[PDB]
Design an enzyme around this catalytic site. Structure first.
Site, short mmCIF file in Angstrom:
data_model
loop_
_atom_site.label_atom_id
_atom_site.label_comp_id
_atom_site.label_asym_id
_atom_site.label_seq_id
_atom_site.Cartn_x
_atom_site.Cartn_y
_atom_site.Cartn_z
N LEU B 41 0.83 -1.22 0.12
CA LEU B 41 0.14 0.02 -0.02
C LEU B 41 0.82 1.25 -0.07
CD1 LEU B 41 -3.10 -0.80 2.16
CD2 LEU B 41 -2.92 -0.50 -0.18
N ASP B 42 0.17 2.35 0.02
CA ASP B 42 0.84 3.79 0.21
C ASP B 42 0.47 4.40 1.44
OD1 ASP B 42 2.50 5.80 -0.58
OD2 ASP B 42 1.59 6.17 -2.31
N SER B 43 1.27 5.48 2.00
CA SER B 43 1.07 6.09 2.89
C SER B 43 -0.31 7.00 2.93
CB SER B 43 2.17 7.31 3.46
OG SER B 43 2.62 7.71 2.05
N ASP B 45 -2.75 5.83 1.05
CA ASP B 45 -3.69 4.76 1.49
C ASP B 45 -3.80 4.17 2.92
OD1 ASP B 45 -4.00 4.50 -1.47
OD2 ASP B 45 -2.57 3.03 -1.59
N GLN B 46 -2.78 4.58 3.56
CA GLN B 46 -2.92 4.23 5.02
C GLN B 46 -3.75 5.31 5.91
OE1 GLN B 46 -1.42 5.56 8.00
NE2 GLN B 46 -1.72 3.80 9.42
#
Ligand SMILES: CCCCCCCCCCCCCCCCCC(=O)OC[C@H](COP(=O)([O-])OCC[N+](C)(C)C)OC(=O)CCCCCCCCCCCCCCCCC
Ligand SMILES: CCCCCCCCCCCCCCCCCC(=O)OC[C@H](COP(=O)([O-])OCC[N+](C)(C)C)OC(=O)CCCCCCCCCCCCCCCCC
Ligand SMILES: CCCCCCCCCCCCCCCCCC(=O)OC[C@H](COP(=O)(O)OCCN)OC(=O)CCCCCCCCCCCCCCCCC
Ligand SMILES: *C(=O)CCCCCCCCCCCCC
Lengths: 155, 87, 165, 177, 62, 111, 65, 79, 50, 171, 459, 122, 70
Positions: B41-43, B45-46
Site C-alpha cells: 500500500l501507500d502512506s 492509502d494508510q
C-alpha cells in the site's frame, strides 16, 4: 522548598540570567524575563502569550483539564488563559474584517430604523370615535367639570 | 443503548472494512498482514484506511497513534484498549 | 410556541439518542422510515411553526402579523418581521430536508429504537397539544381588544404567501 | 513541534496530517457521500501528481502553498466527532471517573458488601507494592546520564516483573463508568 | 392501598389549607379580595332580587 | 371563593411536597421520578379546575395570606395573583413539564 | 422481546408505531381539511374590502364649485 | 453478544449514483476504490427515499377519506 | 426558633396597627381629616418675627 | 371578624345562574363534592375546637396611653419632660404609619375589586390616599435617620415661616 | 447586662479546672447554654430601648450583634479544635481563655451607654486578636500581619479619643441617652471639619475603607480559623456600630462632608470585586469580598436614611454569617490539601458531595439570592442610594454582576471539572465539619422567615 | 398601500395625515349631518367591566356576545353568531372610518384645486 | 448480565451525619409541635375586651397567645 528557588530581582549579568533559566527549568536562549520598567514583575519569564486552548489536546498532559505539565513555568496570566476564560484561537476570518462587518451591520440597521421611524406606515382610516365626549368620565375625569362637547357625526 | 463490543466483533468489522477496499484483494490479506510490505500500500492509502475505520467506529484516532498503526491486529488492539472491551 | 417548541425539542432529543449522542445534522438522513413516529411529530411541529392553517401556530402568528400589518407601526420593523417569517420557513424545511430525507449518513452499526412507552406517550400527548390546543384556547379565551378584520386582499394573504415563497 | 516521543514533525508527517485535515474539511463541505467521494478522488489526484518530487525545497514550497490553500477554503464549522476535543460529548463523563484510591477510604461496613472484589484489590495492591522497588531499580539502571532524552518508557525485559510505572495507566477509569 | 396518593397528597392538604383560609385568612380583613362578578342586562341579582332592565332596541343592520 | 384559592394553593403545596419528601430520605427511593411525574399530573388537573372556573365566570383573586414585613409605609406580604395570565399559563406549563419529565425518564435512564 | 440491532441493513420496525404515525398524520390532515371546510374565512378573508376611490361624491359631502 | 455480519460480496455499486461517480472518474481517468464501502447506504431498505412534497403529504390519503366521510355524515345528519 | 416565633408583640408592631384601627374609626365618624399637616398644634407654638 | 367601617366594602351583587344549554357544567358538581368531602369535616373540627375554647375563656386588652405634655411645653435641656414627649411622638409616628398603611390597603382593595372600570369607580379612595400622603410628607419626610421631636418641630417652624412669608408677599 | 458578663467570666474557671481532655466539651456546652440564654435581649419596645443600669443598655441595634457573638463562640471552639490537637495542654487552655476574653470584651462593647467605655472596650478587643494572630498562625507573614493590623487601627483611634474627651468638656456628658436630647447642630468650620475627621477615621479604618483596607488581606490569610472568624464576622462591625452611634453628634456637617468617602467606597467596591475576579488565593478572595461588602455598609451609613440603616444592619449580620461560613469552608479545604492555592485542588464534587452542597449554598448566599437577608440588606441599601441619586444605581448594578462573576467562580475552580491526579489524601467529610457548616447556615436560612429582629433600632 | 407612495414620494400637501383629522368642519358640504347614536348606557357599560378600548360605538353587541359566552358554558362554540354580529359591526365602523379618510383626502384635493385656480386667475 | 463495579466515594459518613442531624432535630421538634398544637386546641387564644372601670391589667395581659403571655 528553599530560598534560592523563589523568584528574585531582575537579572543583569549573563551568569544570573543562566541561573534564573536553570531555576525556571528551560533553556537560557528561551528565557526572556519581563523588561525592568519598575512594574513589579521581576525575573518572571515572558511566555509567548497564548491561551491553553491552543495546546495539543491529544497529548498525555499531567493536568488535562488545564493542558499543563508538571514543573513547566506557568504564565503570569494563567488564570486568564484557562479554558473557562478568554480564548485566543485562530479565527477563520480576520479580526478587523469581522469588527468592521459587525459595526456596519449594526449601524446600518440602526440608521434604517431611524429612517423608518421618520416615515411610518398606516392604513387609510380616520381616528377612532368614542362616545360620551371621548369617554370623559371613563378616562378618570372629574364629574363636576363638564367636558367640552365632542360630537361625532355619521358618515 | 450502546451495545457492548467484543474482540471478535471488532476484528470482524475491521476485516469487513478492509475487504470492502478495492486496492486490497480479499484472497491474500490476513489479520497479521502489514500494509506497506505484505500488501504493498501507500502512506495516503494508510491515511484512507485510518479515516475509514474512524468513520466506521464513530470515534477519531489521533495522528500520533494513526501513524504507528500499520496492521489489522494493531488496529484491533488499539480500538480494544480505547473502548475498554473484554471486561 | 411553548407547545410546539417543547415537542420539537423532544423529537430532536429522540433522534439524537437514537444516533449515539450525535447532534450534527450533516451525519443524519434516511430517518423518514427508520423512525416513523418521530418523523410524523417533527413534520407536524415544523408545519405548526411555519404557520400551517388551523394548527396551533395559525391561531397566534397569523393574527399577530395581521395586527402588525394594518397598524401605525414602523415600516422597517414590519419588513424585517416578514423577512424573518420567510427565514423561519427556510430553516424549518432545511431541518426537514437534512435530518429526515435523503440517504443515510450515520455509522454502520444501527441501533435505532424508539418503542419505549414513555417516549411514545410523551410525544403523543404533545402532538395532541400541538394539534388542538391553539384552537381550544383561542375559542375559550374572552376578548380583550378589538380584532382587526377589515383589511385588503394583499395584506390578508401576506403571511401564507411569504411562507410559501 | 509538540510530540510525546519525538522532538519535531518530519516532512512526511506534515504532508499526511495536511491530507487528513483537508479530506476531513472536504467531507464537511459537501454533505452527501457521492459528491464527497468524487472530490476526494480529485484531491487524491492532486496529491498524487506531486508525489515523486525529489527537490526538497520545492516540496517545502508546495507544502506552504497547500497550507495556504487549505486555510483559504476551510469550513467555518467543520464536523467534529462527539468524543473528539471540541465535540458535543467531549469530556462529559469526567464527573463519573472516580479514582480507585477512594476505595481505600470506604467504611468497613460498606466494605463487607463486596468481599471478593476487595480481596482481589488487596492482591493487586500487594503485587504493586512488591513490584515497585524492582521496577524503580529497572528505571534507574536504564536511564542514561543526564536524565532520559525522550518520554518513551522501557518495557519489562525480565521474567516475572512488570513494566515500570504501570499502576495509574492500568487502573484508569473506563470511558463509560 | 390503591388510593394512598389520592388521599395523603390531595385530600389532607386540601383540608389543612381550607381550614387555614376559612378560619385564619378570611378572618383578617382585605386578605382575599375578589373581582366583582360581571352584571349583564337581563340578569337577576341573587342578593336582593332586583332585575337589571334590558338594553334599548337595536337599530338592526343585517 | 373557598374553592378557587383552596385549589390553587393546594396546587402549590402539592408541587412543593416532593422536595420535602426527597429531603427526608434514609433508604434509596423506589421510583422517585415516577412519583414526581404523578405529582405533576395531579397538580396539572388541580390547576386545570380553576382555569375552567375562570373560563365560565371570570373570577380573579388576590390571596394576601402571610403578612411578612411591615417597613414604615411599605408592607410586604405573601400575595398571590390569579388573573387571566396565571390561569392560562399554569396548566400549559404543567402539561409541558409532565411530558418533559416522562421523556426525561426515558432519556436520562442511565444517569 | 426487544428489537435486535442490525449491521448496515434496514432496522426492524414495529407495526404499532407505524400504525400510530399513520393515524396521527391522517388525523392532522383531516383536522386541517375539516377546519378549512367549516371556517374558511380566517385564511381567505372575513369581510369584503370596498374601494375608497369608488365612493360617490354626494355621499362624501363634496361641494361642487 | 454475538453479532453476525452479512455477506461482503453483495455490496456492489449497481443501481446507485456511485456508478455515476465512477463514470465521471473513468471519463477523467481515475479510480474510486471506496465505492463498495459506501454502497450499503444506497441499496436495500434505504433506497428510493421520498421527496419533500411527499414527506409533507404523509397520511393525506386516509385524512382525505376521513374528511369526505365526516362531511357526508354531517350532510346526512343536517337533513 | 420557637421562642423567636412567639415573641410578645415585638416593637409593638401589631399594636400600632390596632390603635390606628381605632383612630381612623374616630375621625371618619365625625368628619375630621385623616391626618393634619402640622404635627403639633399651631396655637401653642410661637414663631420669631420676620 | 374585623370592623366594617374602617375596612369598607361595597354591597355585593351576584347575578343568578341562568344557563342556556343542556350540558351540565362540572363546576356545580365539583362544588357539591367540595361541600360534601371538604367543608363538612373542616366545619366539624372547627366546631369541636371552638367548643373546647368555650370552656376556658380569658381576655387580652388593648393598652391605653394617657396624654403627656408634648415637646412645645418642655424647657430647654430638661430631660425629664422631653423624654416623655419624645416617646409620645414615636408612638404617634407609628400610629400615623399604620394609618397610611390602612389607606394604601383601601386603595389596593378598591382597584382590585372594581375590575376593568377601576379608573372611575375608585376616585374617593385615590383622593383620600393623596390627602394622607400629602399630610405624611409634610409631617415626617426629610427628617433623616436620626429623627426626633425637635427636628419635626424645626421643620414645622420652617414651614409656617415660609407660609407666612408667602401670604405676606401676596397681600 | 450582668447576667451575661458573669457566665462569660466564669467560663475561664471552667476551662482551667477541667480535665485533661474535657476542655472542649465543657466549653462548647456552656457557651451554647450562654447562647441559648442570650435570646432574652429581644425585649424591645417600639419607642423605648432596653436600659439595664447606668452603664449598660441594649437597643435593637446592639442586640443582633450580641446574639451573633455569643452564638459564634461555640462555633469558634468547634472550628479551632483540629489544628490544635498537637498543641500543649497549657497552650490549649491559653487559646480558649483568649477566645473567652475576646468574646467578653465584644459583648461588653455593644452594650456600653458611655462612649468612653465603648471606646475602651473597642480598643481592648485589639490585644487578644493580635496575640492570636501572631502566636497561633501558620505562616511567617503573620508577624508582619501583626503590625499592619495594629498600627493602622490605633492611628485612627488615638485622635478620636481626644475628640471624645472634647465632648466631655463641651456637652458635659458622653452618655448616649443624654446626648440624644442635648445634641446641637454642627456649624461649618475647619474645627468641626477636623473633629468630624477625628470621630470618623477610626471607624473607616476598622470597617475598612478602600485605601485604608491594606491590613485586611494580610490579617485574614495568615490568621488561624478562629482569628479569621473573629475578624470577618464581628470585628468589622465595630466600625459600623461606632458610625451609627457617632453620626448623631455630627449633624448637619455630614451632608457635604461624606462626598469623598462615598466616592471612595463606590469605586472601591468595583475595584475589590475586580481584584476578586483575579485572586489566586481563596482566603484573599474572601477578604476582598469582605472589603467590598463593608464599603457598601459605609455608603449606607453615610447617606443616613432609615432604609439605608436597615439595609446596613441586615447586611452586617448576613455578611458576618456568610463570611464565617466561607472561611470555615476554606479552612476545611486547607486542612485537607495543606495549601491555599485555588487551582491546586479541583473537581471536589466527585469526592465530597455534601461539602459541594455546602459550597454551593454558601456561594448562593454570598451573591444575595432572595429571599435571604443578604438580598434584603443589599436591596434596601440600593433603594436608599437610588433615593440619594439616580446615577449611583449604575455603580451598584455593575458591581452585582462582578459579584456573580467571582462567587460562582470560587465555586467552579474548587468544585467542578476534572479532579487532579496527584492528590490522593482527600479524606471523607468529618461529622464535626458538617456540624459546623450546618450550624453556620441554618440560622442564616431561618432568619429569612423573621427578619424584623435584624432591621435596626428604627424598624 | 398606495397612499404611502402618494404622500412620501409625491406631495404631502394633498394627502391627509393620520395624526390629526378632521381639519375640515363637519358641517362643510354636508347639509344637516346626523350624529351617531349610542345604544349601550354608561351604567350598563360600567358594570359589565368592558375594556376602555372595547367601549366603541356598538359595544352592545359585545355585551350580548359576552353574556351568551358566559351563559353557554361549557359549549364554547355554541353561539358564534353573536361574535359574527360584533365583527360585522366593527367592520361597518372601519368602513365609516375609511369613508372619513376619503372625504378628507377629496376635500384637501379640492382646496388645492381652488388655490391653483386662484394662482391661474391672478 | 456482566455487572461491573461502580467506583464512588464513601457516602457512609455523609449519610451518618444527615441521619444524626435529622434525629437530633426531630427529637425536640416533635414534642414542641405536639405541645403547641395541644395548647392551641385546648387552651386556645385570648379575646379582645375593653378594660373595665376600677381595674388595671397586668403587664402580660396585653398579649393574645398563651406562649407570648408566658
Ligand atoms: C403536612 C402537615 C401540615 C401541618 C398539619 C397540622 C396543622 C394543620 C393546619 C392548621 C395550622 C394552624 C392554623 C393556621 C395557621 C396559623 C394562622 C396564623 O395567624 O399564622 C401566623 C402567620 C400569619 O401571618 P400574620 O399576619 O398572622 O403574622 C404577621 C405577624 N407580624 C405582624 C409580626 C408581621 O403565619 C402563617 O400562617 C404561616 C405562613 C406559612 C406559609 C408561608 C411560608 C413562607 C416560607 C418562606 C419565607 C420567605 C418568604 C419571602 C417572600 C414573602 C412575600 C414577599
Ligand atoms: C439575630 C442575630 C444573630 C443571628 C444568629 C442567631 C443564632 C441563634 C439562632 C436561634 C434560633 C433561630 C432564631 C430565628 C428564628 C427565625 C424563624 C422564626 O421563628 O420565624 C418566626 C415566624 C413567625 O411567623 P409570623 O410572624 O408570620 O406569625 C405570627 C407570629 N405567631 C407565630 C406567634 C403566630 O415563623 C414562621 O413564619 C413559621 C411558619 C411555619 C413554618 C414554615 C412553613 C413553610 C416552610 C417552607 C415550605 C416550603 C416552601 C417552598 C420550598 C421549596 C424548596 C426550597
Ligand atoms: C397550503 C397550500 C399548499 C398547496 C399550495 C401551494 C403549493 C406550493 O407552494 O407549491 C410549490 C412547491 C412545489 O413546487 P415545485 O418545487 O416547483 O415542484 C417540486 C414538487 N412539486 O412547494 C410545495 O408544494 C410545498 C409548499 C408547502 C407550504 C407550507 C406552508 C403553507
Ligand atoms: C399599500 O401599498 C400599503 C400597505 C402597507 C404598508 C406596506 C406593507 C408591506 C408588507 C405587506 C405586503 C407584502 C406583499 C408581498
Amino acid at each position: 522548598i528553599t530560598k534560592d528557588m523563589l523568584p528574585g530581582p531582575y537579572p543583569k549579568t549573563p551568569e544570573e540570567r543562566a541561573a534564573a533559566a536553570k531555576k525556571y527549568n528551560m533553556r537560557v536562549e528561551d528565557y526572556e524575563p519581563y523588561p525592568d520598567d519598575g512594574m513589579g514583575y521581576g525575573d518572571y519569564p515572558k511566555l509567548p502569550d497564548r491561551s491553553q486552548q491552543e495546546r495539543d489536546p491529544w497529548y498525555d498532559w499531567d493536568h488535562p483539564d488545564l493542558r499543563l505539565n508538571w514543573g513547566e513555568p506557568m504564565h503570569w496570566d494563567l488564570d486568564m488563559y484557562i479554558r473557562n476564560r478568554v480564548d485566543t484561537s485562530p479565527t477563520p476570518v480576520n479580526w478587523n474584517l469581522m469588527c468592521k462587518h459587525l459595526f456596519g451591520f449594526v449601524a446600518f440597521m440602526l440608521f434604517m430604523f431611524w429612517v423608518g421611524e421618520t416615515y411610518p406606515t398606516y392604513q387609510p382610516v380616520g381616528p377612532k370615535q368614542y362616545p360620551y365626549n371621548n369617554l370623559y368620565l371613563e378616562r378618570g375625569g372629574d364629574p363636576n367639570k363638564e367636558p367640552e362637547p365632542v360630537v361625532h357625526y355619521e358618515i | 443503548d450502546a451495545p457492548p463490543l467484543t474482540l471478535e466483533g471488532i476484528k470482524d468489522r475491521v476485516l469487513y472494512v478492509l475487504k470492502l477496499y478495492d486496492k486490497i484483494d480479499p484472497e491474500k490479506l490476513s489479520v497479521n498482514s502489514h500494509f506497506m510490505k505484505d500488501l504493498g500500500l501507500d502512506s495516503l492509502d494508510q491515511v484512507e484506511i485510518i479515516m475509514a475505520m474512524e468513520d466506521e467506529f464513530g470515534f477519531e484516532i489521533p495522528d500520533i497513534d494513526a501513524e504507528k498503526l500499520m496492521c489489522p491486529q494493531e488496529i484491533v488492539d488499539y480500538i480494544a484498549d480505547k473502548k475498554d472491551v473484554y471486561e | 410556541h411553548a407547545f410546539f417548541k417543547a415537542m420539537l425539542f423532544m423529537c430532536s432529543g429522540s433522534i439524537i439518542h437514537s444516533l449515539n449522542d450525535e447532534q450534527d445534522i450533516r451525519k443524519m438522513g434516511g430517518l423518514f422510515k427508520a423512525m416513523p413516529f418521530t418523523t410524523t411529530a417533527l413534520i407536524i411541529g415544523s408545519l405548526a411553526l411555519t404557520g400551517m392553517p388551523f394548527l396551533t401556530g395559525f391561531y397566534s402568528k397569523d393574527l399577530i402579523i395581521e395586527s402588525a400589518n394594518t397598524s401605525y407601526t414602523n415600516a422597517w420593523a414590519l419588513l424585517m418581521t416578514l423577512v424573518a417569517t420567510s427565514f423561519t420557513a427556510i430553516y424549518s424545511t432545511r431541518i426537514i430536508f437534512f435530518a429526515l430525507l435523503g440517504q443515510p449518513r450515520f455509522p454502520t452499526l444501527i441501533n435505532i429504537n424508539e418503542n419505549n412507552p414513555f417516549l411514545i406517550n410523551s410525544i403523543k400527548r404533545l402532538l395532541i397539544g400541538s394539534l388542538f390546543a391553539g384552537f381550544i384556547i383561542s375559542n375559550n379565551i374572552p376578548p380583550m381588544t378589538i380584532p382587526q378584520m377589515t383589511m385588503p386582499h394583499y395584506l390578508k394573504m401576506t403571511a401564507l404567501t411569504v411562507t410559501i415563497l | 513541534a509538540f510530540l510525546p516521543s519525538a522532538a519535531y514533525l518530519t516532512h512526511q508527517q506534515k504532508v499526511l496530517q495536511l491530507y487528513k485535515r483537508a479530506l476531513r474539511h472536504l467531507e464537511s463541505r459537501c454533505v452527501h457521500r457521492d459528491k464527497y467521494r468524487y472530490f476526494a478522488c480529485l484531491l487524491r489526484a492532486r496529491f498524487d501528481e506531486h508525489k515523486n518530487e525529489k527537490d526538497m525545497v520545492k516540496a517545502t514550497q508546495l507544502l506552504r502553498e497547500a497550507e495556504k490553500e487549505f486555510w483559504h477554503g476551510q469550513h467555518p464549522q467543520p464536523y467534529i466527532f462527539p468524543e473528539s476535543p471540541g465535540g458535543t460529548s467531549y469530556e462529559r463523563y469526567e464527573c463519573y471517573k472516580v479514582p480507585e484510591w477512594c476505595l481505600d477510604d470506604w467504611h468497613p461496613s460498606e466494605k463487607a458488601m463486596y468481599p471478593d472484589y476487595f480481596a482481589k484489590r488487596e492482591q493487586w495492591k500487594k503485587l504493586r507494592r512488591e513490584s515497585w522497588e524492582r521496577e524503580v531499580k529497572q528505571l534507574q539502571e536504564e536511564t542514561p546520564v543526564g536524565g532520559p532524552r525522550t518520554e518513551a518508557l522501557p518495557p519489562a525485559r525480565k521474567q516475572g516483573d512488570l513494566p515500570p510505572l504501570w499502576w495509574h495507566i492500568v487502573t484508569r477509569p473506563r470511558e463509560r463508568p | 392501598r390503591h388510593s394512598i396518593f389520592a388521599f395523603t397528597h390531595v385530600l389532607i392538604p386540601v383540608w389543612i389549607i381550607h381550614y387555614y383560609l376559612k378560619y385564619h385568612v378570611t378572618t383578617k380583613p382585605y386578605t382575599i379580595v375578589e373581582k366583582k362578578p360581571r352584571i349583564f342586562p337581563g340578569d337577576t341579582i341573587l342578593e336582593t332580587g332586583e332585575v337589571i332592565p334590558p338594553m334599548k332596541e337595536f337599530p338592526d343592520q343585517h | 371563593m373557598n374553592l378557587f384559592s383552596s385549589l390553587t394553593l393546594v396546587t402549590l403545596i402539592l408541587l412543593t411536597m416532593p422536595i420535602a419528601a426527597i429531603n427526608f430520605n434514609t433508604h434509596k427511593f423506589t421510583n422517585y421520578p415516577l412519583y414526581v411525574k404523578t405529582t405533576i399530573s395531579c397538580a396539572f388537573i388541580t390547576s386545570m379546575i380553576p382555569t375552567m372556573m375562570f373560563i365560565h365566570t371570570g373570577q380573579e383573586m388576590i390571596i394576601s395570606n402571610w403578612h411578612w414585613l411591615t417597613i414604615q409605609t411599605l408592607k410586604l406580604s405573601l400575595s398571590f395573583k390569579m388573573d387571566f395570565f396565571s390561569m392560562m399559563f399554569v396548566p400549559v406549563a404543567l402539561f409541558v413539564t409532565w411530558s418533559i419529565m416522562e421523556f426525561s425518564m426515558w432519556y436520562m435512564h442511565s444517569d | 422481546a426487544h428489537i435486535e440491532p442490525r449491521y448496515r441493513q434496514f432496522p426492524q420496525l414495529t407495526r404499532s408505531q407505524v400504525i400510530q404515525a399513520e393515524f396521527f398524520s391522517a388525523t392532522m390532515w383531516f383536522w386541517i381539511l375539516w377546519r378549512f371546510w367549516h371556517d374558511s374565512d380566517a385564511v381567505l378573508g372575513h369581510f369584503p374590502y370596498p374601494d375608497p376611490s369608488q365612493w360617490t361624491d354626494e355621499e362624501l359631502g363634496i361641494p361642487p364649485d | 453478544s454475538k453479532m453476525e455480519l452479512p455477506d461482503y460480496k453483495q455490496w456492489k455499486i449497481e443501481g446507485t449514483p456511485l456508478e455515476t461517480v465512477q463514470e465521471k472518474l473513468a471519463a477523467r481517468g481515475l479510480r474510486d476504490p471506496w465505492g463498495r464501502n459506501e454502497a450499503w447506504r444506497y441499496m436495500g431498505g434505504f433506497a428510493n427515499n421520498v421527496s419533500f412534497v411527499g414527506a409533507l403529504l404523509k397520511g393525506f390519503k386516509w385524512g382525505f377519506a376521513a374528511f369526505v366521510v365526516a362531511v357526508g355524515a354531517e350532510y346526512y345528519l343536517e337533513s | 426558633s420557637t421562642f423567636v416565633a412567639y415573641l410578645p408583640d415585638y416593637r409593638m408592631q401589631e399594636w400600632a396597627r390596632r390603635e390606628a384601627e381605632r383612630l381612623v374609626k374616630y375621625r371618619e365618624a365625625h368628619g375630621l381629616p385623616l391626618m393634619e399637616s402640622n404635627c403639633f398644634d399651631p396655637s401653642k407654638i410661637q414663631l420669631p418675627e420676620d | 371578624s374585623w370592623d366594617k367601617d374602617v375596612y369598607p366594602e361595597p354591597p355585593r351583587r351576584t347575578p343568578a345562574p341562568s344557563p342556556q344549554t343542556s350540558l351540565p357544567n362540572p363546576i356545580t358538581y365539583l362544588t357539591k363534592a367540595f361541600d360534601l368531602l371538604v367543608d363538612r369535616p373542616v366545619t366539624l373540627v372547627r366546631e369541636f375546637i371552638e367548643r373546647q375554647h368555650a370552656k376556658n375563656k380569658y381576655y387580652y386588652y388593648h393598652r391605653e396611653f394617657r396624654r403627656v405634655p408634648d415637646i412645645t411645653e418642655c424647657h430647654e435641656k430638661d430631660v425629664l419632660c422631653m423624654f416623655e414627649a419624645e416617646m409620645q411622638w414615636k408612638r404617634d409616628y407609628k400610629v400615623d404609619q399604620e394609618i397610611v398603611n390602612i389607606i394604601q390597603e383601601r386603595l389596593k382593595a378598591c382597584q382590585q375589586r372594581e375590575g376593568e372600570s377601576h379608573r372611575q369607580n375608585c376616585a374617593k379612595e385615590l383622593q383620600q390616599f393623596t390627602q394622607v400622603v400629602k399630610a405624611y410628607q409634610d409631617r415626617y419626610h426629610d427628617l433623616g435617620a436620626h429623627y426626633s421631636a425637635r427636628k419635626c418641630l424645626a421643620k414645622q417652624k420652617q414651614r409656617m415661616l415660609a407660609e407666612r412669608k408667602a401670604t405676606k408677599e401676596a397681600a | 447586662m450582668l447576667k451575661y458578663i458573669i457566665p462569660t467570666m466564669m467560663l475561664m474557671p471552667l476551662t482551667w479546672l477541667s480535665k485533661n481532655s474535657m476542655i472542649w466539651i465543657n466549653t462548647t456546652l456552656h457557651s451554647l447554654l450562654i447562647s441559648l440564654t442570650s435570646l432574652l435581649l429581644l425585649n424591645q419596645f417600639g419607642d423605648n430601648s432596653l436600659n439595664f443600669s447606668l452603664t449598660f443598655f441594649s437597643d435593637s441595634l446592639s442586640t443582633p450583634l450580641l446574639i451573633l457573638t455569643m452564638w459564634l463562640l461555640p462555633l469558634m471552639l468547634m472550628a479551632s479544635q483540629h489544628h490544635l490537637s498537637k498543641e500543649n495542654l497549657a497552650r490549649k487552655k491559653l487559646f480558649i481563655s483568649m477566645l473567652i476574653l475576646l468574646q467578653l470584651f465584644l459583648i461588653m462593647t455593644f452594650t456600653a451607654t458611655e462612649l468612653i467605655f465603648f471606646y475602651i472596650m473597642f480598643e481592648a478587643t485589639l490585644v487578644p486578636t493580635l496575640i492570636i494572630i501572631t502566636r497561633w498562625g501558620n505562616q511567617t507573614e503573620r508577624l508582619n500581619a501583626g503590625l499592619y493590623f495594629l498600627f493602622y487601627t490605633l492611628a485612627g483611634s488615638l485622635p478620636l479619643l481626644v475628640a471624645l474627651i472634647y465632648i466631655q468638656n463641651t456637652m458635659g456628658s458622653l452618655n448616649f441617652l443624654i446626648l440624644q436630647y442635648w445634641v446641637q447642630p454642627m456649624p461649618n468650620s475647619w474645627s468641626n471639619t477636623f473633629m468630624w475627621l477625628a470621630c470618623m477615621m477610626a471607624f473607616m479604618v476598622k470597617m475598612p475603607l478602600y485605601g485604608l483596607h491594606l491590613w485586611l488581606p494580610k490579617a485574614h490569610v495568615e490568621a488561624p480559623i478562629a482569628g479569621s472568624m473573629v475578624l470577618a464576622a464581628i470585628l468589622l462591625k465595630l466600625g459600623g456600630y461606632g458610625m451609627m452611634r457617632i453620626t448623631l453628634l455630627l449633624n448637619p456637617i455630614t451632608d457635604f462632608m461624606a462626598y469623598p468617602f462615598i466616592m471612595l467606597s463606590l469605586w472601591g467596591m468595583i475595584m475589590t470585586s475586580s481584584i476578586c475576579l483575579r485572586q489566586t488565593d481563596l482566603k484573599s478572595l474572601i477578604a476582598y469580598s469582605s472589603v467590598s461588602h463593608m464599603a457598601l455598609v459605609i455608603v449606607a451609613i453615610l447617606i443616613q436614611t432609615p432604609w439605608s440603616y436597615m439595609g446596613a444592619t441586615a447586611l452586617m449580620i448576613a455578611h458576618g454569617l456568610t463570611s464565617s461560613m466561607l472561611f470555615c469552608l476554606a479552612n476545611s479545604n486547607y486542612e485537607r490539601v495543606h495549601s491555599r492555592t485555588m487551582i491546586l485542588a479541583r473537581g471536589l464534587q466527585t469526592l465530597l458531595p455534601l461539602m459541594a452542597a455546602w459550597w454551593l449554598l454558601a456561594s448562593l448566599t454570598n451573591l444575595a439570592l432572595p429571599p435571604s437577608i443578604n438580598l434584603i440588606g443589599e436591596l434596601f441599601v440600593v433603594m436608599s442610594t437610588f433615593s440619594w441619586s439616580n446615577i449611583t444605581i449604575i455603580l451598584m448594578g455593575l458591581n452585582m454582576v462582578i459579584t456573580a462573576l467571582y462567587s460562582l467562580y470560587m465555586l467552579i475552580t474548587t468544585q467542578r471539572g476534572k479532579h487532579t491526579h496527584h492528590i490522593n489524601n482527600i479524606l471523607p467529610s468529618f461529622t464535626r465539619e458538617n456540624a459546623l457548616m450546618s450550624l453556620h447556615m441554618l440560622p442564616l436560612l431561618l432568619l429569612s422567615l423573621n427578619p424584623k429582629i435584624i432591621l435596626g433600632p428604627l424598624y | 398601500g398606495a397612499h404611502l407612495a402618494r404622500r412620501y414620494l409625491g406631495d404631502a400637501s394633498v394627502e391627509p395625515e393620520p395624526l390629526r383629522m378632521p381639519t375640515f368642519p363637519p358641517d362643510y358640504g354636508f347639509p344637516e349631518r346626523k350624529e351617531r347614536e349610542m345604544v349601550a348606557t354608561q351604567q350598563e357599560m360600567n358594570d359589565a367591566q368592558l375594556v376602555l378600548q372595547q367601549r366603541d360605538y356598538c359595544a352592545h353587541y359585545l355585551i350580548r356576545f359576552l353574556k351568551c359566552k358566559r351563559d353557554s358554558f361549557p359549549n364554547f362554540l355554541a353561539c358564534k353568531h353573536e361574535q359574527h354580529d360584533w365583527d360585522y359591526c366593527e367592520h361597518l365602523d372601519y368602513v365609516k372610518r375609511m369613508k372619513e379618510f376619503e372625504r378628507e383626502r377629496r376635500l384637501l384635493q379640492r382646496k388645492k384645486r381652488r388655490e391653483q385656480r386662484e394662482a391661474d386667475m391672478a | 448480565g456482566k455487572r461491573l463495579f461502580i467506583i464512588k466515594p464513601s457516602g457512609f459518613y455523609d449519610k451518618r451525619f444527615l441521619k444524626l442531624l435529622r434525629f437530633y432535630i426531630l427529637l425536640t421538634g416533635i414534642p414542641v409541635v405536639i405541645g403547641i398544637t395541644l395548647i392551641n386546641v385546648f387552651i386556645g387564644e385570648a379575646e379582645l375586651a375593653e378594660i373595665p372601670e376600677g381595674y388595671v391589667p397586668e403587664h402580660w395581659e396585653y398579649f393574645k397567645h398563651p406562649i407570648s403571655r408566658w
